[PDB]
Amino acid sequence: NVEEETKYIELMIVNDHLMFKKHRLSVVHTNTYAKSVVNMADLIYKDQLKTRIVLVAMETWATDNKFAISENPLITLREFMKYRRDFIKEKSDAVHLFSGSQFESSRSGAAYIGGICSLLKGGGVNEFGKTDLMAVTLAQSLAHNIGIISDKRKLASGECKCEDTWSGCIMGDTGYYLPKKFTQCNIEEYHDFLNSGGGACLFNKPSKLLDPPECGNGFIETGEECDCGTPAECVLEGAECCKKCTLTQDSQCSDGLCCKKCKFQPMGTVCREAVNDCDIRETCSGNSSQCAPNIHKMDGYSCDGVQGICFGGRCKTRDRQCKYIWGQKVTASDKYCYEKLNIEGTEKGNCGKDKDTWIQCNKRDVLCGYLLCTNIGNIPRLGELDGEITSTLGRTLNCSGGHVKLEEDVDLGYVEDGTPCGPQMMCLEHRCLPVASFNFSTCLSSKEGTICSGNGVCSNELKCVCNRHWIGSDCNTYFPHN
Amino acid sequence: IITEFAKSQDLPYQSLSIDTFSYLNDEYVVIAQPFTGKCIFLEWDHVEKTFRNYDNITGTSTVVCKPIVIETQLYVIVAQLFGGSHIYKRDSFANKFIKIQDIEILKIRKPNDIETFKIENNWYFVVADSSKAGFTTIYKWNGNGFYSHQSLHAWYRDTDVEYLEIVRTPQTLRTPHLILSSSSQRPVIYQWNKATQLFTNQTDIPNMEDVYAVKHFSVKGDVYICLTRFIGDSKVMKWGGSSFQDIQAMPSRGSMVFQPLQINNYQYAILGSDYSFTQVYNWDAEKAKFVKFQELNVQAPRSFTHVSINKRNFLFASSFKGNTQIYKHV
Amino acid sequence: KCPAVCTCTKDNALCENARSIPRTVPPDVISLSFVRSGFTEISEGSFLFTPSLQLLLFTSNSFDVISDDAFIGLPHLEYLFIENNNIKSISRHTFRGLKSLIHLSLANNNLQTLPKDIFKGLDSLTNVDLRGNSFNCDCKLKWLVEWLGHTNATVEDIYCEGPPEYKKRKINSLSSKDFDC
Ligand SMILES: [Ca+2]
Ligand SMILES: [Ca+2]
Ligand SMILES: [Ca+2]
Ligand SMILES: [Ca+2]
């Protein structure tokens, strides 16, 4: 499943001018330092998260900084992500900035929560430090990127506690004695993020690295045909297929999900089952050692029932938002709350925080305003309460909300953009707008207003994942075979 | 005859900090055991000629147990990595330690060092906080407790704080000073402001990067400091009146402690090592430099403390990975 | 496991008076030391069995010859402190394969000469220590002068002890052409 596979974070590191200065104005020294940091972070990740941190690209600002580095990690993160969107063009899962300055906050770095595999959010900023300390900082930034957060509710309730009372755990505040392990709740959060469709870009094994090839690293690079890694674990799998990074006579692979007993597993076999409604099952191609890259349904499909629209392979609803902000016991409040609170209210139902007259939401659809949930507790799972928890009361309904903030200026207490406010009707900026406004792309279809000529699902890469036994590009020709 | 350090006892537990104090005309030793969360109190047995266990304070992850004697009353500042830091008072009537105060968890989060000092008949202690969120704070004794006085080095991971008194030389009198050591930063010298009753005039010590700890000693009225570097060169510097100038450098291989110790008017310096032997240095008065004296076999030394008992001198070596050791200067 | 001659720990072993290089040292150690050991000849492939060594230290030993390329099997060795010993001969290819060595020490070894191009291949070096030696500054030592004048790693000041006309001056101050011999 998703939890036994190995995930690969193709990471790109950007060293600013201050980080360049901190290493005697030498490119090679900065590159070696960053490689060591990434290697220790990978050592931390591989043991517990079953995830490899692979450094695939790097750039150093030897001349000067491309933007003004601020002492606020969040402003620096926003500016760095804008620069990455505008200027950085290398393909990577995450792009993290190695900054030589020191941030003036409690945190040694800032990263977007669950933002990996995204152009606008897939990255973070980290401040200079010792190689081990800065490796811990990079590890926690990447954990934020892969949906691992410090659950305030469970920590206060004592549901889970870090097993190390000396060095603490990675998500906590770091002292002289650096942490080495994640809590069990962190592992569970990572697994939940993976099972919700997140991190679909972490299932490809990198082919080109920044390091010279090693016989036993694990990655099949140029020239090498097979690589089972260190011979210690090669006995479990690939011992009879690959020896000394060389094929053993009649052999087809070294390792992989789509290749068993040194032989290409027949085409059509399942290598990755769909984890949720937005995911697309991956089938072996019959001539590849590794399973196909994790593709899911494009942004626009309907997940669950009608309450959600896929966005990055993850279902986006109001109930899921309530659970993500407050807790699993919390459920979305009834539509009665919305239509009788957002129409007329102050600090209890609204669609904005303008100080003049708040916002008088129009009765077209008030589902895009204040996020009203049921059974809200006293503290949220993440963020910070900007104010006080709302409490409003032939049926009696418990109805509550909040104004939780996050690393950005976005208010979590409002309904996320993209949530369905109606049939063929989805929220955008506190306004229930038609789906045409989002400008969603489509695959190639031959009929009128269909998807891949009717039969066929459009994937995230805008290619038709054809139905069973339809070879045609637009899923139009039925070709019987076996 | 010549002197040397002979091993006396092996205490079967690890330790980080070892402290000594005088309480009711008696000499005591406090050992902070990290992994059991205990402040172990030892007293000198006048019958068996050994150090007997006296009392215990139970914590969770104790890094420092600093004793403070304020007017014949013993207070212990216990710094903990987990569960917060507390202040205890020795109740001589019941012969037990009572917890009299709690330090806020939001202020002191990851303590690494505690230093106590007296300025004009006022008692202070400083906690070095190794976290960005927690700041190095000065607490002042107001007659019934310790309350926050000043925060010094914000957003820095301070690993050591050193109190010393040095003569700045537009003047002749000796004024209080504080030296702060932080990760990836140069040591910082603070000067006490008598008017505002605060430590001000932040100033760096140049050419010394990533110093773990600083410890001072005096030789014939001249103040020197020992600079602790984990891997590299540990250095000795001399106060020139307005700055510290290098005296000599020493090879450091896993060195977490560089402790000056004065025993019988003899100046010693012990440089610990996690990867090699621990080197004891003797001060050559004619050459005004430390010369190699002896090698100690202690597993990952964390501190070195000298105890004087009725004209017998003892050396307590705290071992982070093995048995803490007691030596005798013979 | 830990040899009886070595006082090992979770991640550090201190082998004192060992007459041979340990081979069955537990692979969880990342720091190995040798103080006043008995063996006087480090041969090739003496550290293959311990690939986890990140720090290697020698002190107060007595070495006749250190064999060619004696540090294979240590792809993560960042610190190598061969100091305070008495090494009669050091080999040219000794430090081969140490592409991650950032700190190397050869201090107080009473060395009088060093083979040509011994530091080549150590691109990651950031600090080389060579104090306490008695290097002869003559025609057999142009390579070190050129390397000191060309390298970027922090090397502390060292002094000549060779010809009477080259007494007590920095090798960093020596010139490539200036070698009377
Ligand atoms: Ca990828
Ligand atoms: Ca390879
Ligand atoms: Ca899939
Ligand atoms: Ca101190």
Numbering used by the authors:
A (entry chain A): 233 to 625, 630 to 718
B (entry chain B): 222 to 551
C (entry chain D): 41 to 221
Paper text:
LGI1 is a 60 kDa secreted neuronal protein that consists of the N-terminal leucine-rich repeat (LRR) domain and the C-terminal epitempin-repeat (EPTP) domain. Meanwhile, the S473L mutation of LGI1 causes epileptiform seizures due to reduced binding to ADAM22, which is a member of the A disintegrin and metalloproteinase (ADAM) family and acts as a receptor for LGI1 in neurons without protease activity. The ectodomain (ECD) of ADAM22 consists of a metalloprotease-like domain, a disintegrin domain, a cysteine-rich domain, and an EGF-like domain. As such, the LGI1–ADAM22 complex maintains normal nerve signal transduction through the interaction network, including synaptic ion channels.
